[PDB]
Amino acid sequence: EMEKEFEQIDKSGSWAAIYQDIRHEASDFPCRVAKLPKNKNRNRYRDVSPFDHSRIKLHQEDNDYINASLIKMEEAQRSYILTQGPLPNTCGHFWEMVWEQKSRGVVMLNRVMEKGSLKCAQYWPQKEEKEMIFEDTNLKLTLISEDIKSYYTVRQLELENLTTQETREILHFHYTTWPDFGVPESPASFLNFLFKVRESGSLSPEHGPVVVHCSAGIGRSGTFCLADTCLLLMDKRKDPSSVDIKKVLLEMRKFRMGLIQTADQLRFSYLAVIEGAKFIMGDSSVQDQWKELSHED
Ligand SMILES: O=P(O)(O)C(F)(F)c1ccc(CCCCc2ccc(C(F)(F)P(=O)(O)O)cc2)cc1
């Protein structure tokens, strides 16, 4: 069973060794476009770039580049777009991507300001009477409402293509207490949040891929997507213990570099998937238990 393996690794203190094996076996593909001198100011970090083969292209004749990758999980039957936290000059690009890809939801796992340094730009309106307009991409964003919780906030936003005047409702899921290179507080808090995104219907195949991002778009976002995909797999092959988390992660890194940034986030991923498995195979009360333990109120 999954628990026995998790316990064996914990006992021998091998999480750092497993994580290191992952970095060494991980795919390596070119990122030429990301490295073009003209795209230098479109990347938040120097050594974090989307692979050329899976990068998301903007539908604009000028510069189609944005630091975002399309993670397509064939067997699990789900796609996610992982991107960095928008910079002061790429907020228009960010929303242009949401529109063109037809995304229904956006998942933010970092904070605009963490420990002083600006870890991300304020790309969505904080007050309803203050809509935002992105002149470069000709888009309008309005805060329709928001439900604030102890560790996460869900916002309803209206995105409008000012060119065609078409309107779309975007759901914003902001996890506010997940530190850089850190982990969520308990599997219950994480899963409670993950299931909030699921039930909203934002991850449905009827919509474009959900856009997920943290600061660099690989650590926290990698953890969120790995857990979701694994819970998806062990509900599909109805033989959960066959799902090899390490292999799933390596499959994901084929689409974007450095997913999961610490040995501890890897361990958490196992903890979250194991705890989440309870639901996937029977228990229809553990969800309330998670909401209970999460202390979202
Ligand atoms: O000479 P200097 O020291 O100034 C420097 F240039 F070498 C220099 C270059 C690059 C970096 C930052 C590298 C990316 C960090 C990053 C990765 C992951 C996460 C996250 F894991 F946290 P995530 O959850 O947002 O993905 C956040 C940030 C630092 C310093």
Domain ranges in the chain are 1-297
Tell me the C-alpha distance between 13 and 32, whole Å. Answer: 38
Q: Is residue 48 lining ligand 1, measured as CB closer than 6 Å?
A: yes
261 marked as part of a ligand binding site: yes
Amino acid at 42: R
Tell me the C-alpha distance between 243 and 266, whole Å. Answer: 15
With residues binned 3-state (H G I as helix, E B as strand, rest as coil), the percentages for the chain, rounded to 5, are 40, 20, 40
Ligand 1 centroid from CA 239, angstroms? 38
Q: Which two tokens stand for residue 18?
A: 């497993």
Give, in order, the Cα–Cα distances in Å from 161 to each of 99, 132, 137: 8, 12, 9
21 marked as part of a ligand binding site: no
Tell me the C-alpha distance between 224 and 237, whole Å. Answer: 21
Burial label, 208 (beta-carbon count in 10 A; 0-12, 13-18, 19+): middle
Tell me the C-alpha distance between 215 and 85, whole Å. Answer: 5
Query: Of 250, 234, 266, nearest to 76 (Cα)?
Result: 234
- Region for residue 212 given its phi and psi (left: phi exceeds 0; alpha: psi -120 to 50; beta: otherwise): beta
How is 75-123 classified by DSSP, letter by letter? TTTEEEEEEPPPPTTTHHHHHHHHHHTT--EEEE-S-SSSSSS--S---
Are 277 and 2 contacting, i.e. CB atoms less than 8 angstroms apart?
A: yes
Tell me the C-alpha distance between 81 and 208, whole Å. Answer: 9
* Ligand 1 atom 25: residue of nearest CA: 215
Are 171 and 202 contacting, i.e. CB atoms less than 8 angstroms apart?
A: yes
For residue 233, give the H/E element and its range. helix 220-236
Are 249 and 226 contacting, i.e. CB atoms less than 8 angstroms apart?
A: yes
Q: Which two tokens stand for residue 242?
A: 């066959």
Tell me the C-alpha distance between 105 and 102, whole Å. Answer: 9
Residue 177: partners with Cβ closer than 8 Å, 6 or more residues away? 151, 152, 184, 185
Are 204 and 104 contacting, i.e. CB atoms less than 8 angstroms apart?
A: yes
220 marked as part of a ligand binding site: yes
Residue 126: partners with Cβ closer than 8 Å, 6 or more residues away? 143
Ligand 1 centroid from CA 191, angstroms? 27
Q: Which atom of ligand 1 is nearest to the CA of 214?
A: 25
3-class DSSP string for 13-58? CCHHHHHHHHHHHCCCCCCHHHHCHHHHHHCCCCCCCECHHHEEEC
Query: Of 225, 266, 257, nearest to 46 (Cα)?
Result: 257
Tell me the C-alpha distance between 80 and 235, whole Å. Answer: 19
Give, in order, the Cα–Cα distances in Å from 172 to each of 89, 246, 283: 20, 29, 28
Solved with: X-ray
Tell me the C-alpha distance between 257 and 66, whole Å. Answer: 15
Q: Is residue 29 lining ligand 1, measured as CB closer than 6 Å?
A: no
Residues present in the chain in total: 297
Q: Is residue 259 lining ligand 1, measured as CB closer than 6 Å?
A: no
Are 260 and 266 contacting, i.e. CB atoms less than 8 angstroms apart?
A: yes
Tell me the C-alpha distance between 212 and 227, whole Å. Answer: 13
- For CA atoms 105, 207, 287, 6, the dihedral sign is negative
Q: Ligand 1 pocket check: which of 261, 262, 265 to mutate, most ligand atoms within 8 Å of Cβ?
A: 261
Fold classified for 1-297: Protein-Tyrosine Phosphatase; Chain A (3.90.190)
Q: What is the dihedral of CA 237, 241, 247, 253, to 10 degrees?
A: 70
What is the Cα 142 distance to its own chain's centre? 22
- Region for residue 92 given its phi and psi (left: phi exceeds 0; alpha: psi -120 to 50; beta: otherwise): alpha
Angle CA 145–294–245, to nearest 5: 105
Q: Ligand 1 pocket check: which of 214, 221, 269 to mutate, most ligand atoms within 8 Å of Cβ?
A: 214
Ligand 1 centroid from CA 95, angstroms? 24
Q: What is the DSSP letter of 170?
A: E
Resolution in angstrom units: 2.3
Q: Is residue 180 lining ligand 1, measured as CB closer than 6 Å?
A: yes
Q: Which residues are catalytic?
A: 214
Burial label, 121 (beta-carbon count in 10 A; 0-12, 13-18, 19+): middle
Query: Of 168, 181, 187, nearest to 218 (Cα)?
Result: 181
Query: Strands 210-213, 78-83: parallel, antiparallel or unpaired by DSSP?
Result: parallel
- Region for residue 138 given its phi and psi (left: phi exceeds 0; alpha: psi -120 to 50; beta: otherwise): left
